[PDB]
UniProtKB/Swiss-Prot annotation:
Organism of origin: Homo sapiens (Human)
Cellular component, GO, one term: basolateral plasma membrane
One GO biological process term: response to antibiotic
Residues that hold ATP according to the record: N41, D83, K102, F128
Interval of the full protein contained in this chain: 11 to 224 of 732
Residue spans crossing the bilayer: none
Family: Belongs to the heat shock protein 90 family.
Domain notes: The TPR repeat-binding motif mediates interaction with TPR repeat-containing proteins like the co-chaperone STUB1.
Positions of modified residues (N6-acetyllysine): K48, K74
Official protein name in the record: Heat shock protein HSP 90-alpha
Cellular localisation: Nucleus; Cytoplasm; Melanosome; Cell membrane
Region (Interaction with NR3C1): 1-214
Gene from which the chain derives: HSP90AA1
Keywords on record: Acetylation, ATP-binding, Cell membrane, Chaperone, Cytoplasm, Host-virus interaction, Hydrolase, Membrane, Mitochondrion, Nucleotide-binding, Nucleus, Phosphoprotein, S-nitrosylation, Stress response, Ubl conjugation
PTM info: ISGylated.
Chief localisation class: nucleus
C-alpha cells in the first residue's frame, strides 16, 4: 500500500540566494575550506549538547558519545559529515538554513567581488554555504531531542525542501551529505581528506573518525 509523504518547499532569503549563486558560478581557489566549515558547525552542535546535558543528563538518552564521522563514498560521489550534536528541529532547519536573513551576507559578497579568499566565509557566519563550492546538491538529515528526524535538501537555484525523514533513524545529531560535482571527486580520497582535516580542523575538541570503504 502506497506511502504518502509531506514535502515543504521554501524560498531562500534573497541575499542567501545571491550568495549561493555567487559560490556556484564563480571560480574559487582554495575550495577545501568547505570541510573546515562543516566540522566547525558539528563542533558547535557538539558543545551545545554537551552543555545542555549538564543541565539535564537525560538529553544524552539519544546517545552518550560525542564525535564526528567522515564518510566518503566513491560509488555514489557523496561525502557525508556526521555529528552526534544537539541536532536541528524542523523550525531550526527552516530558520537557520536559508529562511532568515544573515547580517554578514551583504558584507561577505562585497568582500568576494573585491577579491577576498572564500576562506573568509566563516567569519561572516555564512560558512555552511561553502558546501556549494564542492557540491551540486546538499542533503541535511537532522534529529533533535525535542523533535522528529527531518531532511532538508537543496540543489540551490533559489529553493530548498524540508520533509520528515523516512530513512534510517539517527538518534540525535546531524548528517550533511554532499553530492559532489564531477570535477571535485578529490574529497573522496582519504589522503586528501586527511590532509585538510590536519591543515584546518586541527583543534576541534571532539574525536573525528574517517571511515574508508574497502
Ligand atoms: N551540524 C549541525 N548541527 C546542528 N546545527 C547546525 C549544523 N549545521 C548547521 N546548523 C545550524 O545552521 C546554522 C548556520 O549558521 P550558524 O553556524 O551561525 O549556526 C548554524 C546552526 O544553527
Amino acid at each position: 500500500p502506497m506511502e504518502e509523504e509531506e514535502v515543504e518547499t521554501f524560498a531562500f532569503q534573497a541575499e542567501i540566494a545571491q550568495l549561493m549563486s555567487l559560490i556556484i558560478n564563480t571560480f574559487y581557489s582554495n575550495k577545501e575550506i568547505f570541510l573546515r566549515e562543516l566540522i566547525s558547525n558539528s563542533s558547535d552542535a557538539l558543545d551545545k549538547i554537551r552543555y545542555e546535558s549538564l543541565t539535564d543528563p537525560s538529553k544524552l538518552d539519544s546517545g552518550k558519545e560525542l564525535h564526528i564521522n567522515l564518510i566518503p563514498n566513491k560509488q555514489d560521489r557523496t561525502l557525508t559529515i556526521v555529528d552526534t550534536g544537539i541536532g536541528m528541529t524542523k523550525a531550526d532547519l527552516i530558520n537557520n538554513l536559508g529562511t532568515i536573513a544573515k547580517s554578514g551576507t551583504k558584507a561577505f559578497m562585497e568582500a568576494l567581488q573585491a577579491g577576498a579568499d572564500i576562506s573568509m566565509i566563516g567569519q561572516f557566519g555564512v560558512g555552511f554555504y561553502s558546501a556549494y563550492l564542492v557540491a551540486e546538491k546538499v542533503t541535511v538529515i537532522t534529529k533533535h531531542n525535542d523533535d522528529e528526524q527531518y531532511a532538508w535538501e537543496s540543489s540551490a537555484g533559489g529553493s530548498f525542501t524540508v520533509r520528515t525523514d523516512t530513512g534510517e533513524p539517527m538518534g540525535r545529531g546531524t548528517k550533511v551529505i554532499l553530492h559532489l560535482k564531477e570535477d571535485q571527486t578529490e574529497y573522496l580520497e582519504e589522503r586528501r581528506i586527511k590532509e585538510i582535516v590536519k591543515k584546518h580542523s586541527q583543534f576541534i575538541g571532539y574525536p573525528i573518525t574517517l571511515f574508508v570503504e574497502k
